[PDB]
Amino acid sequence: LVQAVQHVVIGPSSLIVHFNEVIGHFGCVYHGTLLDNDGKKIHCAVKSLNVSQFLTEGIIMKDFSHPNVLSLLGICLRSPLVVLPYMKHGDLRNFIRNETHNPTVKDLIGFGLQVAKGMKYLASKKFVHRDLAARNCMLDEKFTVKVADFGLARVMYDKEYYSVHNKTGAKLPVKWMALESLQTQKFTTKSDVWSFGVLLWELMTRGAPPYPDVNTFDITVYLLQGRRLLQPEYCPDPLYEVMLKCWHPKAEMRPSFSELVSRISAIFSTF
Ligand SMILES: CCOc1ccn(-c2ccc(F)cc2)c(=O)c1C(=O)Nc1ccc(Oc2ccnc(N)c2Cl)c(F)c1
């Protein structure tokens, strides 16, 4: 493990944490400066963790290289610190909810296509996300969407959406979970497809909360009855058909991420 983690570990002398520049219970995010031995100084975001599994997550994230997936600059051991490239426009949900922003109907479909591309890359590597949602996607200075996971850093802020299992300790985002995951607590690439369907609905409503009139406990019965999220006012009919296929009760009937990239590219560029 020590030899395997060598390329991910950053020395404490190489990282400058700007503690008086907070970005945002389980950890704080601050502005930072990373001192690169072979290039220019890097502006970063540093997340503090208030151990063996953590370093293996570091090795997996360091192997990611795709314009639609958040990369890892490294990990600093001394509380442990996670070093990420800085994302100028924060999370995707807060960006589209901002009343001073004017994304077009095509721009919103475009953000959906970017997520599908990042997920197609992850699924080809057999990586299961388990928490795909607009709040976990980042936006850089060039408006490029980066698929990521805050982990436990926003569970208290997003307390309305998260359940924590009393036995396994698992993070459970009930209103983004596939029917079979709510019944078995098992996650697959096909249950990530269901979550992507919910993410598309969030984009086309500019960040509205899903099922606002349905109790947490009533979600399983609501879904077994065959009921689903309603078509947003400015969501095109072919894009709603895509959402409905992502929510099929049989995991095997749901489209692959390759089929999603193809259908959304058609919707995005065709009239
Ligand atoms: C090493 C363990 O951590 C992981 C592990 C896996 N993945 C992961 C999981 C699935 C994927 F597909 C890809 C990556 C992660 O995303 C993280 C993580 O820590 N992400 C994280 C994200 C945003 C943060 O906040 C920022 C950052 C930059 N700019 C601004 N403005 C803000 Cl607010 C932040 F601090 C930390």
From Swiss-Prot:
Result of changing Y162F: Complete loss of kinase activity. Alters interaction with PTPN1 and PTPN2. Loss of interaction with PTPN1 and PTPN2
Stretches of the chain found on the membrane's Cytoplasmic side: 1-271
Result of altering Y161F: Complete loss of kinase activity and of ligand-induced ubiquitination. Alters interaction with PTPN1 and PTPN2. Loss of interaction with PTPN1 and PTPN2
Interaction with MUC20: annotated span: 247-271
Modified residue annotations for Phosphotyrosine: Y157, Y161, Y162
Outcome following mutation: H31Y: In RCCP; constitutive autophosphorylation; causes malignant transformation in cell lines
Substitution effect: V147I: In RCCP; germline mutation
Resulting phenotype, Y161C: In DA11; not phosphorylated in response to HGF; severely decreased tyrosin kinase activity
Residue positions, PTM Phosphothreonine: T216
Catalytic residues (UniProt): D131 (proton acceptor)
PTM remark: Dephosphorylated by PTPN1 and PTPN2.
Domain Protein kinase: residue ranges: 17-271
Residues engaged in binding ATP: I23, G24, H25, F26, G27, C28, V29, K47
Region (Interaction with RANBP9): 139-271
Effect of Y240F: No effect on ligand-induced CBL-mediated ubiquitination
Subcellular localization, as worded in the UniProt entry: Membrane
Expression (tissue specificity): Expressed in normal hepatocytes as well as in epithelial cells lining the stomach, the small and the large intestine. Found also in basal keratinocytes of esophagus and skin. High levels are found in liver, gastrointestinal tract, thyroid and kidney. Also present in the brain. Expressed in metaphyseal bone (at protein level).
Protein family per UniProt: Belongs to the protein kinase superfamily. Tyr protein kinase family.
Implicated disorder: Activation of MET after rearrangement with the TPR gene produces an oncogenic protein. Defects in MET may be associated with gastric cancer.
Domain-level remarks: The kinase domain is involved in SPSB1 binding. The beta-propeller Sema domain mediates binding to HGF.
Subunit: Heterodimer made of an alpha chain (50 kDa) and a beta chain (145 kDa) which are disulfide linked. Binds PLXNB1. Interacts when phosphorylated with downstream effectors including STAT3, PIK3R1, SRC, PCLG1, GRB2 and GAB1. Interacts with SPSB1, SPSB2 and SPSB4. Interacts with INPP5D/SHIP1. Interacts with RANBP9 and RANBP10, as well as SPSB1, SPSB2, SPSB3 and SPSB4. SPSB1 binding occurs in the presence and in the absence of HGF, however HGF treatment has a positive effect on this interaction. (Microbial infection) Interacts via extracytoplasmic residues 25-656 with L.monocytogenes InlB; MET can bind HGF, its endogenous ligand, and InlB simultaneously. InlB probably dimerizes upon binding to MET, which encourages subsequent dimerization of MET.
Known role: Receptor tyrosine kinase that transduces signals from the extracellular matrix into the cytoplasm by binding to hepatocyte growth factor/HGF ligand. Regulates many physiological processes including proliferation, scattering, morphogenesis and survival. Ligand binding at the cell surface induces autophosphorylation of MET on its intracellular domain that provides docking sites for downstream signaling molecules. Following activation by ligand, interacts with the PI3-kinase subunit PIK3R1, PLCG1, SRC, GRB2, STAT3 or the adapter GAB1.
Protein known as: Hepatocyte growth factor receptor
Organism: Homo sapiens
Portion held of the full protein: 1062 to 1344 of 1390
